[PDB]
Symmetry: C3
Subunit: 282 residues, 3 copies
């Protein structure tokens, strides 16, 4: 880990003295869900590039910003554009923001991402609540906590079985009723794989048999660092595609389609998140 405790502190303090805003809820917008930034009011934007110690983006979409503001009654901070392991970032960089949020005073982290559906029942457009995750990179060593533990943040061996807030998932199921939507609010296990290439059929079968419902290339690292911090954690996946499970099918998962789905069910996710803010304690 290239960051000392001081680096996290210096970054937090810089931010605190450059905005009057004091966030409680941190929101990490996944792929094609950065729209949420438009719904904040009293919005103050910061480019990642101007924030000391922040991972400087390579050349994905060149858009990397921290937006502070209010979202339906909650003092928020949103990450529009997140860091991925597949881009070459070591996990201690990918999750660097999460620890900054904590020192800013945040106590809740909402994570969203786009993911392939592994559960045969899921459909494009569906929203899946995350009850649990399978951290494959973590089993092998790619765990954001690897390295000396800093007592100031958390314990050496933090538990994850209770990572996804029970209370918030229920209130999420509740709130969805108010939406009175056509489809139900899905719920299941999220499995992380490093990517950046998509799964083969054999690989999809594996992920299925392991009990995963959706597959993505992010999130788990941030969740683990959050929990290690004491942050409350809630999140969901936008099923942008149904991974191929048979060899007969003549279709391929492509970024084009993912973004497309990200465009359709776009504001559908944003609403849910904005409303759910009221369901978050203080």
């Amino acid at each position: 880990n290239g960051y000392t405790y001081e680096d996290y502190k210096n970054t937090a303090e810089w931010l605190l003295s450059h905005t009057k805003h004091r966030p409680q809820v941190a929101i990490i917008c996944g792929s094609g869900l950065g729209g949420l930034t438009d719904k904040l009011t009293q919005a103050q934007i910061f480019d990642y590039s101007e924030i000391p110690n922040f991972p400087r983006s390579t050349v994905p979409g060149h858009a990397g910003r921290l937006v502070f503001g209010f979202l339906n009654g909650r003092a928020c901070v949103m990450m529009q554009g997140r860091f991925h392991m597949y881009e070459g970032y070591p996990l201690w960089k990918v999750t660097f923001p999460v620890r900054v949020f904590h020192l800013l005073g945040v106590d809740t982290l909402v994570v969203t991402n786009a993911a392939g559906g592994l559960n045969p029942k899921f459909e494009v457009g569906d929203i899946m609540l995350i009850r649990d995750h399978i951290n494959l990179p973590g089993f092998s060593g790619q765990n954001p906590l690897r390295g000396p533990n800093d007592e100031r943040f958390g314990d050496r061996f933090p538990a994850m079985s209770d990572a996804y807030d029970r209370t918030m998932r229920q209130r999420a199921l509740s709130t969805w009723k108010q939406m009175g939507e056509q489809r139900e609010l899905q719920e299941g296990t999220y499995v992380m794989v490093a990517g950046p290439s998509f799964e083969t059929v054999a690989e999809c079968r594996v992920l299925q048999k392991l009990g995963a419902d959706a597959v993505g290339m992010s999130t788990v690292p941030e969740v683990i660092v959050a929990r290690h911090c004491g942050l409350r954690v809630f999140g969901f996946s936008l099923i942008t595609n149904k991974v191929i499970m048979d060899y007969e099918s003549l279709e391929k998962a492509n970024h084009e389609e993912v973004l497309a789905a990200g465009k359709q069910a776009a504001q559908k996710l944003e609403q849910f998140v904005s409303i759910l803010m009221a369901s978050i304690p203080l």
Copy 2:
């Protein structure tokens, strides 16, 4: 990744100006299958050590060469001796040749390797066509594409479900009939593990339950880089041994036996490959 786009270009151009040969098909010979180099005509040999930017071998068998020539009607380029992750090479070195081949004008990659049989039906000497693969190292982060994507080679999120050419696998099943062999041409899923040590019984059971048919310590990285490039891909495994699946058995998988099998079914593989060249488009 220590290689810039320029490095790949400089290597390709050096090769292009040092041989009149212009390959279409690149062939990566696995363990004990380097014999194929003898069947090329108008053969021109290059030691890896003389090629700019090529990974310089440590001390496996000290034989590392690029052989250009013609194989049964096709302008080829063969790798006699390939790079492995278990030797300490980062995947961007292991797969460095594949991207060079692409800039040389190659459009097809044939990969062969030796592997343990996981499917109880397979037998030593058997040849298994590869219909799909399970990339375990990739799930955790060891994917040759990790790092910034260069648009010039391919897309950020390339698909792999259609990695192994459907057309060529059928023509391979076809051609094998002409061989009129005793045993049938096997076909299945290849699972990659990093090695260099062999699987325990419990591990073999795992690989079996994941749906793999053969286990090896290579290939998948080259395949992914090829596909990312647009290369057509065909390949197979020589089942040099039946991995131990029970604790009662009193035998151990050893390099001696693998090489031995590599010696027996030696020319049997070479023929198939040489003939199959005619089955490859242009």
Copy 3:
């Protein structure tokens, strides 16, 4: 690997000329099992920090020592405090001692660790003999042998299916009868995960379905290096907790509880080990 063959030699020779002791059996004490050091006689202690080339501890418990002596008729060497991958150590450091032991003249390695129980039959306090292991980090590349192989230690592709000594496991089952204990001596498969955070429910389910009986964050690397060396290997896990397998349960795995169990069944393990020494050849 940052160590040349010379480094291992220099460390062994330094040790040999700083103690008259000449160990035959090396014992690696897991978490809360370092008590075994008290049972050695003619004991000579060495802090890891004073041993050339030894990984210098960060700040776990600040206790890192090599204790030479005699344990019930056997010339031993014990590691009180072992190195873990989750602390940031590359596997070639974690396993550096094992190769030193070999050059000191050791021919047997006994490994103990604390682990969560995955098999529903196991109970806290139980002792599980290790018949086999599933090396998940190894499948992805985190194998202590990665890098050039040194013929002087072992072969390039060492087998592991026979890693856990058949003879010693039987004599262990035998000896346990003499204990005439309430509970039986358990036996099963150990799965290694990198940690340092604990498994989620979904992850526990995975490990279960893979056929593991106990999960830990160590051991496998040392075992592989031992075997590669020719060392006889015997070991066991102290089931300090039953991993959560359902979402209803309202309990969390914590270091507190692990240490607690380490304190209870403490001397129960020590005895077994001390007695078992007599069961070890010469």
